[PDB]
Design a protein around this ligand. Structure first.
Ligand SMILES: [Ca+2]
Ligand SMILES: [Ca+2]
Ligand SMILES: [Ca+2]
Lengths: 437, 437, 437
């Protein structure tokens, strides 16, 4: 009865115009996006007209702020529903995220994942088309503490921010390793410095047999190990809104940002897999992931796709003309630097960071087809971002040529193999997931 | 010489985008509306950008507030002249109705029935087209007391609000029933509590042989009965403006909102029939009614049509994302509710309110043709609103298929039979009124 | 250890300057007020600079709006903490009450009973002095429905308004009287007009053996009677904030507005007595009442005073220069009226309303002395408002002369006798309550 198509993509880090070049492979990507009912991307940049102040985001790679005109490039490329919860949305602070919401609403762009308070950041956004409706929810597990939005109290307003998916890590250690840690705690005098916190709260906050030292949670175990788990509040709250969106839309897509690695950099964190299964358990039709700036595996769970990371769909970090003073300070310089010179010195003249490795310049655009909520097709379109090209040309997306698309499709198939996912391959380098329906 | 077509419709309770789906029956409804000279609907929702505060409208079913973008859906569907006097226009208070007027005027949408003062709410609006002009007046007989607009004094401004059609109800009781009422008044001690109101005003305000007790008017009569009558001020004032509009437009349409039932729910209140006859007596070319959220009869009076209720042309109450705190309090909940969950619990999981009954999901769009003020045709187009479909899909209008349109046309013919109205029926399920001209 | 004095007063209906005349008895009243630690009055007028729109408050006697300069007269007279919850605070709507809050905060005047949302209207205000602190809470049981403030929801803001003390009245009727009421319901056809409300909600909303007809609650009883009861929500919420204020101030005063009469006009409603006992049960040090524009009895409950009504401390209703158009319409006139002529015709040229009766022009200012929360003194100062004087001079307060103060003190003693209250009388006409401490 109802038949809807959804295009998915990863980090859209756009800082320049001319996003879609005159290359036929780039114009064919825009044609692909425009031809779908909904095209989702993750706005990994703060569009700005001047509102806000730069926050110190050194671990995030610096501030990512661009002229608000890049929003026109995003929409003209074909993207129609934006996810905004990520580790850069708060780069201009609470005033910046309020400026972003204003810019998006003035341009008529549906967005989710940020809000004036926590509920607004958690809400889904409903995009209505003549053929049906899509609900988008957006959250992130990577962000500086405090950047999460807050709901109001009877006496104070909330706080603008992002929709959080918090998680805790626990270090499993043997009983002998545990005794050495507490010995180090006592002998270094650190336990003595918690003496008054014991008197104020009534008990040692390091004694939970659990243990909290150096801002890290330790637990006695049979063998050493490492475990992660979602925050129960965030998991239940996000799941709650997913069930709400299922009643009011044909399709529910959950967009999650997560840099956190598993046992190996290409595997997702264990908490992210639990989160993705829960979202589909609550009624989501797809889970699209991003963060690590490279591709990760694709899992089919209860006949619904989980894309743990679609990498970057646009990557123009080194082309931003907005570098904060704290970011400049990370590069020792004998003279004041211009933005382009700053990034050249930051990457060691191109010998480190994202430039030398091909994984940061391959992408994937899935196009899913649903019929009455059932997944009937999941096409895979590999995207090339121009590895090895000059800094001013790399980062713009185009449909990969046959040879490169096959390499990307092989990578995705290999990353998806632990989940039992199979891929059919076309002659042009595109492919599609093998479905059970 | 002059030949004009007017499409009429009922309550437009729009809260979502994609009002006209990709269904050919829905696209053919937009084609029908766009093809007329004037398409009138009743804006039964407050479009908002944030101005105002929710009023407690529990008897009205709750607050009905939507993103102001729904105005674009109304105009793109084909509606061109809006009536705004109804029991929801004041859902965001005087500031909300001032915000609505701003939104409508910024989008170039003609409207009537609300204003900054009582005269502005009473005025007609003149919609001019190359083929002629239509004057629309809009009033409502259902609203919370005080919501009516007010005119200024020499010392104070007026009050923003709606154009009212007030009415009083009188309970006819036998003389023995009357004596019991006054006995109950005296013996319960209620008459004692009016002792000082007697001293301040000079007489008992319950002694009018009329009688006013429990905020109700009682009158001695031969047999028990029930009578209603329009407020003389509102009837003369509205009639006054109708005569004004007749001098300045080719066509004068009066739009009246009224939930009030007659002896049976499908019959209009006796005052509404007197009002409708008066409007045509003063020179109106048509009277379009709405309120009860279902269809009522059609009457031809002095060769002019009276549509006592065209039901809902759009019905998306359960899809609103704006639920006030007082509205939430009507549903006892062990945890905070989302809007969709709140409406599911309010309707008893769909077992009560408007969902179980088909009458709330059938509609009618008449298209009238006038030639020099004379009615020469009155086509009837039954509209389906999707009974039994999921909550996120029902409420959007489309031209009913042959089988359903014939059922709707039978209902209208039956509801119109007490007025002597006859209908010709086409092969597709549409029809037209039998005219005397 | 701590010793604090509190002056109390009733309705302050000020609309003109020169509140304290050059009469030594008036200057001695200001000296009395200025000499206390806290002087409480009820602001029974909307101070305005132009913000808002007049609401239709016919049952309240019309709109009561004045130049905001009257706030300077209130403070210069000696009043220092204002209560604002009453049936006139909303005379200019939600915008007017927001304008009042702005005016009060710009002048540094502590106030309670109105707010931007329901919680702000319920909160106490803390007035701090070098000798200690007083917490004031303000609520009203007389107001037009909907004027109560509202708290926000996750999706909509609250509503500015007043702190409500709602209550329900039940008419006790015999079983035979009950059967006549339902017979009148069925035979008049009124029960037939609820036919669809039965289909929508699932049951007749008039069948609760209780019964709800004509917007009135009826109950079968042994004998006819009349009972009132506080709204459980308002009683528990107000009591909740009283317990909060007790922790943060030396003294807690609850100011309640109530026109509702008991079995006789001088007795308070039964619900008001239950409310007053509860407030002191929760930790309030005094309950000051007002509304009826005349004096009522004084009760000592658990060694804490309850003043059910202190009448008017200022009464200049007929001197307002702001008469709304709806208020003008209550007087049939052959020519447009000026404010003074309008009030002369409204009172029948002075032969009715408040002018002919002395009870509306006598007042009382109690001055309470507390020592560590214990009431050690309660002086009574009768106030004269100028009965029989010209309209432009009556309504301004002054300490009553010996002869008139003794008459007022006799009235208070008589009104307080049913509660077992005794009064000592001084030679000047003032007095004090007989305390058990
Ligand atoms: Ca990131
Ligand atoms: Ca209605
Ligand atoms: Ca009053």
């Amino acid at each position: 009865m109802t038949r809807l198509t959804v295009a998915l993509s990863g980090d859209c880090m756009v800082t320049r115009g001319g996003l879609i070049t005159s290359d036929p492979a780039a114009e064919r990507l825009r044609d692909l996006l425009r031809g779908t009912d909904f095209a989702v991307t993750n706005l990994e940049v703060v569009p700005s007209d001047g509102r806000g102040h730069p926050v110190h985001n050194a671990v995030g790679g610096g501030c990512l702020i661009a002229d608000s005109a890049v929003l026109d490039e995003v929409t003209a490329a074909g993207f129609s529903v934006l996810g905004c919860a990520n580790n850069h949305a708060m780069d201009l602070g609470t005033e910046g995220v309020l400026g972003t919401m204003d810019l998006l609403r003035a341009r008529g762009i549906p967005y989710a994942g940020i809000g004036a308070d926590l509920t607004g950041a958690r809400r889904p956004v409903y995009a209505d088309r003549p053929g049906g409706s899509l609900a988008l929810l957006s959250c992130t597990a990577t962000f500086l503490p405090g950047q999460e939005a807050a709901d109001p109290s009877p006496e104070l307003p909330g706080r603008p921010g992002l929709n959080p998916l918090r998680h805790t890590a626990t270090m499993q250690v043997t009983a002998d390793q545990m005794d050495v840690l507490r010995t180090i705690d006592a002998e270094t005098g650190l336990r003595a410095r918690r003496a008054e916190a014991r008197a104020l709260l009534g008990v040692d906050p390091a004694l939970l047999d659990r243990l909290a030292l150096f801002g890290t949670r330790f637990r006695t175990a049979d063998a050493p190990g490492f475990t992660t788990e979602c925050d129960p509040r965030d998991l239940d709250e996000i799941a709650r809104w997913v069930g709400e969106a299922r009643l009011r839309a044909d399709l529910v897509v959950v967009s999650v940002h997560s840099h956190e690695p598993g046992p190996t950099p290409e595997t997702p964190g264990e908490f992210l897999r639990v989160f993705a299964h829960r979202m589909i358990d609550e009624g989501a039709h797809a889970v699209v992931g991003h963060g690590p700036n490279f591709l990760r595996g694709v899992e089919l769970y209860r006949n619904k796709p989980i894309f743990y990371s679609l990498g970057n769909i646009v990557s123009q970090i080194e082309l931003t003309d907005r570098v904060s003073a704290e970011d400049y300070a990370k590069v020792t310089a004998e003279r004041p630097l211009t933005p382009g010179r700053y990034y050249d010195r930051l990457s060691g003249h191109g010998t480190r960071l994202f430039a030398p490795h091909r994984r940061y310049w391959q992408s994937l655009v899935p196009v899913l087809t649903f019929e009455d909520g059932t997944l009937t097709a999941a096409r895979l379109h590999p995207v090339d971002l121009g590895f090895g090209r000059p800094v001013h040309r790399r980062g713009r997306p185009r449909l990969a040529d046959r040879a490169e698309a096959e390499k990307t499709l092989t990578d995705v198939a290999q990353l998806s193999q632990p989940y039992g996912t199979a891929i059919e391959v076309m002659d042009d380098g595109t492919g599609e997931l093998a479905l059970d329906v």
